[PDB]
Amino acid sequence: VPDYHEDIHTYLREMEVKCKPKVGYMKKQPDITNSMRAILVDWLVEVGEEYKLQNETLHLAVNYIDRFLSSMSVLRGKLQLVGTAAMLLASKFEEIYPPEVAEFVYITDDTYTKKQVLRMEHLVLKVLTFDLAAPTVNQFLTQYFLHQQPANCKVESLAMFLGELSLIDADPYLKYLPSVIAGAAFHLALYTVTGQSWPESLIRKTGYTLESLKPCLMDLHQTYLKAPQHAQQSIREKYKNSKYHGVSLLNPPETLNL
Amino acid sequence: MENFQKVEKIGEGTYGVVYKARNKLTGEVVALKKIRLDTETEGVPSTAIREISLLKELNHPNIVKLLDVIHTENKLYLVFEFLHQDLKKFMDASALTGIPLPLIKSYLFQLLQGLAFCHSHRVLHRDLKPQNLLINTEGAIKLADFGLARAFGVPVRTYTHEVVTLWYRAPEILLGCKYYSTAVDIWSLGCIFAEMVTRRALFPGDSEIDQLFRIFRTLGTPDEVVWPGVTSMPDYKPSFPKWARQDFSKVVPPLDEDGRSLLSQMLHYDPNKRISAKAALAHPFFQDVTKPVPHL
Numbered sequence: 381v382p383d384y385h386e387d388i389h390t391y392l393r394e395m396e397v398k399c400k401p402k403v404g405y406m407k408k409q410p411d412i413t414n415s416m417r418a419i420l421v422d423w424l425v426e427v428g429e430e431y432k433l434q435n436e437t438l439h440l441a442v443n444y445i446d447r448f449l450s451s452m453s454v455l456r457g458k459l460q461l462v463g464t465a466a467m468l469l470a471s472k473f474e475e476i477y478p479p480e481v482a483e484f485v486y487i488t489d490d491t492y493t494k495k496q497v498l499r500m501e502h503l504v505l506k507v508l509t510f511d512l513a514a515p516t517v518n519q520f521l522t523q524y525f526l527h528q529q530p531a532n533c534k535v536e537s538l539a540m541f542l543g544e545l546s547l548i549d550a551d552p553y554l555k556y557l558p559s560v561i562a563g564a565a566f567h568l569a570l571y572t573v574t575g576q577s578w579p580e581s582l583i584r585k586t587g588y589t590l591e592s593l594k595p596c597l598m599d600l601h602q603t604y605l606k607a608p609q610h611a612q613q614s615i616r617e618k619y620k621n622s623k624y625h626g627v628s629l630l631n632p633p634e635t636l637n638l
Numbered sequence: 639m640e641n642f643q644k645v646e647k648i649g650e651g652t653y654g655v656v657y658k659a660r661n662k663l664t665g666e667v668v669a670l671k672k673i674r675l676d677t678e679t680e681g682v683p684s685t686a687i688r689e690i691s692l693l694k695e696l697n698h699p700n701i702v703k704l705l706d707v708i709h710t711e712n713k714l715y716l717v718f719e720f721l722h723q724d725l726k727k728f729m730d731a732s733a734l735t736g737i738p739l740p741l742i743k744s745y746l747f748q749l750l751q752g753l754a755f756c757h758s759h760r761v762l763h764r765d766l767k768p769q770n771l772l773i774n775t776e777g778a779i780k781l782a783d784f785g786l787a788r789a790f791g792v793p794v795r796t797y798t799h800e801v802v803t804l805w806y807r808a809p810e811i812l813l814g815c816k817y818y819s820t821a822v823d824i825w826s827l828g829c830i831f832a833e834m835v836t837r838r839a840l841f842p843g844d845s846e847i848d849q850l851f852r853i854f855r856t857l858g859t860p861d862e863v864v865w866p867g868v869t870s871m872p873d874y875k876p877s878f879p880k881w882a883r884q885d886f887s888k889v890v891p892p893l894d895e896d897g898r899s900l901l902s903q904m905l906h907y908d909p910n911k912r913i914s915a916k917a918a919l920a921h922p923f924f925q926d927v928t929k930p931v932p933h934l
């Protein structure tokens with residue numbers, strides 16, 4: 381338990397409310413859909429795998445994208461360009477060795493120029509007014525992980541897996557705060573692997589009961605149950621490897637009894 | 639951008655150049671940082687993404703305030719509250735007389751308050767030194783230049799190694815530890831506390847191994863007893879000379895019992911024993927703390 385962990389947790393809980401996108405932004409986007417956003421996020425999972433990027437970077441890019449699309453109408457042919465710039469900005473924020481701009485140009489298979497990517501980067505910065513230090517599901521998850529008795533790596537890996545699936549589907553997950561999704565994901569992974577439940581220490585820390593996590597739990601369980609039939613599969617493939625202990629191969633429990 | 643009249647250059651830090659300027663219209667005096675973007679290459683530098691985003695949420699009396707970001711397409715400009723002097727120039731201007739102990743106390747208290755705020759908002763500054771600490775005429779001191787800062791996680795992860803100015807750089811970095819956190823910032827303040835007391839830099843090496851030796855020669859060569867793990871650290875060598883710990887009453891003679899207590903806790907070899915900024919605020923060294931105004 382590190383020196384400032386309770387303070388940071390409290391501050392993150394303050395910032396996650398200030399860093400949220402508009403819930404129903406997609407409904408006023410005349411050209412793009414939730415379905416195209418799923419394609420984009422799924423591709424970005426692929427990109428992160430290819431360049432060995434932190435999962436935190438993935439999470440930041442999606443936050444940037446959702447905040448950006450909340451205030452800018454974007455045409456389908458330019459959606460990928462927003463995401464690439466988002467990824468580039470997340471990498472520069474989070475990574476020790478961000479990939480170069482030429483590498484982000486190269487993975488769009490030359491759909492965009494280097495010029496376009498740098499201009500979008502500048503435009504994203506303006507729209508986000510340089511506020512890039514967003515709280516992510518990932519940040520709350522790693523904090524929750526410290527209240528585990530003891531560390532179960534399959535729980536940890538499975539919770540990351542569930543928290544990542546939530547990035548793909550804007551409806552419904554845009555309704556839930558990151559701290560809430562993380563809780564839902566922590567509980568669902570715990571239950572699945574060991575049978576245990578959202579522990580008392582987390583109820584104390586977050587103020588979250590199983591009752592407050594219910595609505596998000598109900599959604600995440602559906603998402604988990606249907607994951608093998610989803611149009612987008614990069615995350616399931618990601619979490620099939622041994623580095624993640626093959627947790628996406630595990631069976632979701634049929635009921636949660638909540 | 640046209641409202642600003644540049645007066646002079648006042649610094650050049652981790653990146654870009656900083657000017658003293660005046661708002662032609664309001665008369666406010668500010669510090670203007672210029673970052674060139676020269677389009678063709680790599681975009682906005684990560685050093686600036688980090689500094690701006692972090693400073694946007696580091697609003698505290700002991701941190702320099704970011705007032706505005708003026709973002710042209712050719713350049714990027716940061717507007718800061720103006721501070722007239724850094725601690726280095728102040729320490730030179732009182733080489734002979736020394737800084738009065740109340741002023742040392744208060745500056746340290748204030749620096750700890752500003753650093754606690756950072757750590758508690760999950761930011762590591764990673765470049766604390768006398769020329770990055772800015773003073774005004776009213777008795778305040780503030781942390782500046784967040785160019786080398788980052789947002790850390792719980793728990794931490796491997797971060798960049800090429801970090802902190804040589805003289806102020808904690809041993810876990812010099813010796814190559816997988817991991818470092820908030821403790822590296824405290825080591826730097828320990829160094830700075832000492833420098834304020836004696837007039838001279840504490841460990842002024844000119845290479846990594848020279849820096850190590852200088853630390854060793856003062857604090858004693860570290861071993862398993864004092865720092866469980868040293869001898870198994872990546873850049874630790876068995877052939878390091880074994881110097882004995884010098885006595886604090888010779889390292890830092892003007893300090894009383896409370897100050898040596900505090901200084902030794904900021905300078906523990908083991909990062910897990912190194913005092914926190916928040917815990918340091920509670921130290922008896924600070925019970926009689928005031929807000930002295932320099933003869934400035």
Ligand SMILES: NS(=O)(=O)c1ccc(Nc2cc(OC3CCCCC3)nc3ncnn23)cc1
Pocket residue numbers: 648649650651652656669702718719720721722723724725727728769770771772782783
């Ligand atoms: N050289 S000095 O007279 O002691 C001096 C030092 C600093 C300043 N002011 C200053 C200098 C400065 O420089 C940057 C880059 C160099 C390291 C410190 C931060 N950034 C700033 N933000 C607000 N005031 N301010 C003015 C004079």
